Amino acid sequence: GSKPNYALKFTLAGHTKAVSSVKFSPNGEWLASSSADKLIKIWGAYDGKFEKTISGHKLGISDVAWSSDSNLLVSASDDKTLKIWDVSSGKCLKTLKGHSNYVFCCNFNPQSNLIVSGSFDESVRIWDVKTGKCLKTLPAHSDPVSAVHFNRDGSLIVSSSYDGLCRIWDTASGQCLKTLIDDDNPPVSFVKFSPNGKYILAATLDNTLKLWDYSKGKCLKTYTGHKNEKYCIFANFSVTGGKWIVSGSEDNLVYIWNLQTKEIVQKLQGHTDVVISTACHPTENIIASAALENDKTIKLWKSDC
Numbered sequence: 001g002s003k004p005n006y007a008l009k010f011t012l013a014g015h016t017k018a019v020s021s022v023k024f025s026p027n028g029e030w031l032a033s034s035s036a037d038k039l040i041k042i043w044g045a046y047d048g049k050f051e052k053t054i055s056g057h058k059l060g061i062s063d064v065a066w067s068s069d070s071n072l073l074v075s076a077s078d079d080k081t082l083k084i085w086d087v088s089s090g091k092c093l094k095t096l097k098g099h100s101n102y103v104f105c106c107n108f109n110p111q112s113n114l115i116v117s118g119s120f121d122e123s124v125r126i127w128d129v130k131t132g133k134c135l136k137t138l139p140a141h142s143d144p145v146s147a148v149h150f151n152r153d154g155s156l157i158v159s160s161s162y163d164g165l166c167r168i169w170d171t172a173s174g175q176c177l178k179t180l181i182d183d184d185n186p187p188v189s190f191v192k193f194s195p196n197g198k199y200i201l202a203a204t205l206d207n208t209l210k211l212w213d214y215s216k217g218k219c220l221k222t223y224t225g226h227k228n229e230k231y232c233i234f235a236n237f238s239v240t241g242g243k244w245i246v247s248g249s250e251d252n253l254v255y256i257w258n259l260q261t262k263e264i265v266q267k268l269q270g271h272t273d274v275v276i277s278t279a280c281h282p283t284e285n286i287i288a289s290a291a292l293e294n295d296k297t298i299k300l301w302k303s304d305c
C-alpha cells in the first residue's frame with residue numbers, strides 16, 4: 001500500500017555494551033553489527049540467526065561497513081585503527097594505522113579498492129584495501145568527523161563534522177569540490193549520498209534531516225518530528241517498496257517519512273534506549289535497528305510495502 005506496516009519479527013541479543021552500527025550485506029544474506037564491547041557480530045538477515053563474532057580491536061567500535069562483493073568488512077575503532085576482515089574466516093587481513101584519535105566512521109567505495117575513514121582527529125583518510133597503506137590524508141574539518149560516504153561511481157566523498165560543515169571531496173586528488181553546508185553550528189551528525197548520487201541526506205543536532213541537491217547546493221526536503229540533539233544517528237533511503245527516509249531517534253523510536261511528502265508514515269516502538277543505527281535490506285522490505293547501552297539489542301522489522 002501507500003504506507004509501510006513494519007512489524008517486529010526478531011530481537012538479536014549478544015552485545016554486552018551499546019550497539020554502534022548495523023549494516024546489511026549487499027547480497028542480502030547477513031547483518032553485521034559493531035559495538036562499544038569491541039566486537040563485530042554477523043547474523044542471518046531473514047531469521048536473525050547468530051552466525052559468528054569477529055574480535056581483535058583493543059577498544060570499542062563506532063562503525064562497520066561491507067565491501068561491494070559482501071566478502072569483506074571494515075571497522076572503525078577507539079583504538080585509532082581500522083581493521084579489514086575476511087567475513088568467511090573472521091580473520092583480520094589488515095590493520096590501518098595513521099589516525100591520531102578515535103576512528104568514528106568508514107565505508108568502501110563501489111569498486112571496494114579504497115576505504116574512506118573519519119576520525120576525532122578532524123581528518124578524513126583514504127586507504128588502499130590491497131596493501132592497507134594510507135594513500136591520502138585530508139585536513140577535512142576543524143572538529144570530529146561524524147560520517148564519510150562515496151557516491152555511486154566512487155569519484156566523490158561526502159564528509160560531515162561537529163564543525164557544522166558538510167564537504168564534498170574529489171576522490172582522485174583529495175581536493176575539496178564544495179562546502180555544501182557552511183554554518184558555525186549546528187553540528188552535522190550524519191551525511192550520505194542518495195542511491196543515484198544526485199542528493200545528500202544530512203542530519204544536524206537540531207532534530208532535523210535535510211535532502212540537498214548536490215549540483216545546485218540547495219535544500220529540497222526537510223524531515224522533522226524525531227529527537228536528535230546529541231548522537232550521530234544514521235539515516236537511510238528505503239527503496240525496495242515505498243520511497244521512505246528512515247532514522248533512529250533519541251526517544252527510542254525508529255522514524256519513517258515519505259521522502260516526497262515529508263509526512264511521518266510510521267514510528268516503530270520496542271527499543272528501551274536511543275536508536276543509534278538503522279539499515280534497509282537491499283531487496284526485501286526489512287529494517288534493522290540498534291540501541292545504546294540500556295538496550296544493547298538489534299531488532300529486525302518487516303513490511304508488506
Ligand SMILES: O=C(Cc1ccccc1)NCCCCc1ncc(CO)[nH]1
Binds near residue numbers: 021063105147189
Ligand atoms: O554518536 C556517537 C558519538 C557520541 C558519543 C557520546 C555522546 C554524544 C555523541 N556514538 C554512538 C556510537 C557510534 C555511532 C555512529 N558511528 C558512525 C555514525 C555515523 O556516521 N554514527
